[PDB]
Design a binder for this molecule. Structure first.
Ligand SMILES: NC(=O)c1ccc[n+]([C@@H]2O[C@H](COP(=O)(O)O)[C@@H](O)[C@H]2O)c1
Ligand SMILES: [Mg+2]
Lengths: 184, 183
C-alpha cells in the first residue's frame, strides 16, 4: 500500500568519502524520501568487492542509507537504463529518485536511452549556486552543503601518505590501511 | 485501513542450472500462499552464466524475479546476514523463505537461526503425506513431487542425454550456445 520513495546515488565510490554521505543523506532528507541507496557501478580498477566493503562500513550505523548491489552482481558495464528497468520491475511499489550532480545534468542527452529513462525515474539535481537550474529534462532540485572532496584527491592523498581523517569515515580508513588499498 | 506489508517469497539455491522443479516450487509456493512476488536467490562455474539462465527462465513471468544480493557480495553468504540486509533494505516487507521440506528438520543448525526466525517466515515445500520432525512453526505448501536435480541435468548434458522439458527451452539454448557443462 505504501508507494516507497527511494533515492539512488550512483557512482564508483573509489573510495566512498564524506561528500558521498552528505549528498545522499541531505538530498533524501531534504526531499523527505523514505531511504537512499548508494549504488556502486561495476566498471565506470580497484576490486568491486573492496569498494562494496568500504561502502557497507560507511553506511553501517545509519538506517537511512543502504547499499544497492545490483550493478555489482550483474557485472559487465550495465547502462543506467538497464539497471532501473530491472529495479523498477523488481520493485513496482517504488518511486526512484536518481540523484545527480548539477554539473552532470547538462550531459543527460548523452545518456543511453535517456528519454526512456526519465520515464522510469525522477531525476534529482544538486543545485550549485554557480549555474542555472534550467534544463529540458524533468529534474527537481535540492540544495546540499558544498563538500568539495573528490575520490581522485583522496586516492593521491593516500598514495602520498597524507591525512584523510574526517574526509573519509574512520572504518573506511581502517579498511584501506589493513588492506593496503590505493598504494597504501 | 492501515499499511499492508508486501508479502515476498525467496527461494535460495545454486541453480546450476535452474530447472523446471525450481520454477514449480517458486510458483506453487507463491501462488498457493497468495504472495505478491517470489524471488529466486542464487548463492555465490561462472556466476554470470547461472544469472543469465535464471533471468532467461523467468523472463516471461512477472511473478518470478531474481534476487542478486548474494552474487554481489562475492563470498560465502550466511542466510542470516543475507536476510539481515534485505529486511533492513526493505523494512516494509514480510519475507517468506522457501526451503525443501527435507531441509526443514535441519534448520536449528543454521547460523543464528533464532534471530533468523524472527526475521522471516519459513515455508516448507512438501509432497502430501510427507512427515518430518519439525517443532518450529513452518508454513507448509503442498507441491507435486518433481524429482529433477541439477546434478542429474549436468550429467545428462555431459552424456548427451535429452533434457527437454526438464529445463526451460531458453535455458537449453543458452547452455548449448555457450558450451556449458561439457556439452
Ligand atoms: N513487489 C515486489 O516485488 C517487492 C516488494 C517489496 C520488496 N521487494 C524487494 O525488491 C528486492 C529486489 O531488488 P534487487 O534485486 O535489486 O535487490 C527484493 O530483495 C525484495 O525484497 C520486492
Ligand atoms: Mg492439497
Amino acid at each position: 500500500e505504501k508507494k516507497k520513495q527511494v533515492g539512488i546515488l550512483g557512482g564508483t565510490f573509489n573510495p566512498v568519502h564524506l561528500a558521498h554521505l552528505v549528498m545522499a543523506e541531505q538530498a533524501g532528507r531534504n526531499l523527505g524520501l523514505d531511504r537512499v541507496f548508494l549504488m556502486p557501478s561495476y566498471q565506470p580498477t580497484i576490486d568491486a568487492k573492496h569498494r562494496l566493503n568500504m561502502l557497507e562500513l560507511a553506511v553501517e550505523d545509519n538506517p537511512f542509507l543502504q547499499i544497492e548491489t545490483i550493478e555489482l552482481a550483474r557485472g559487465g558495464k550495465s547502462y543506467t537504463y538497464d539497471t532501473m528497468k530491472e529495479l523498477t520491475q523488481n520493485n513496482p511499489d517504488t518511486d526512484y529518485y536518481f540523484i545527480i550532480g548539477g554539473d552532470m545534468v547538462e550531459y543527460l542527452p548523452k545518456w543511453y536511452k535517456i528519454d526512456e529513462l526519465t520515464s522510469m525515474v525522477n531525476f534529482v539535481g544538486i543545485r550549485r549556486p554557480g549555474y542555472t537550474t534550467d534544463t529540458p529534462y524533468p529534474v527537481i532540485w535540492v540544495d546540499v552543503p558544498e563538500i568539495d572532496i573528490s575520490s581522485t584527491k583522496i586516492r593521491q592523498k593516500i598514495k602520498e601518505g597524507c591525512s584523510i581523517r574526517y574526509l573519509v569515515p574512520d572504518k573506511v580508513i581502517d579498511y584501506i590501511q589493513n588492506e593496503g588499498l590505493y598504494e597504501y
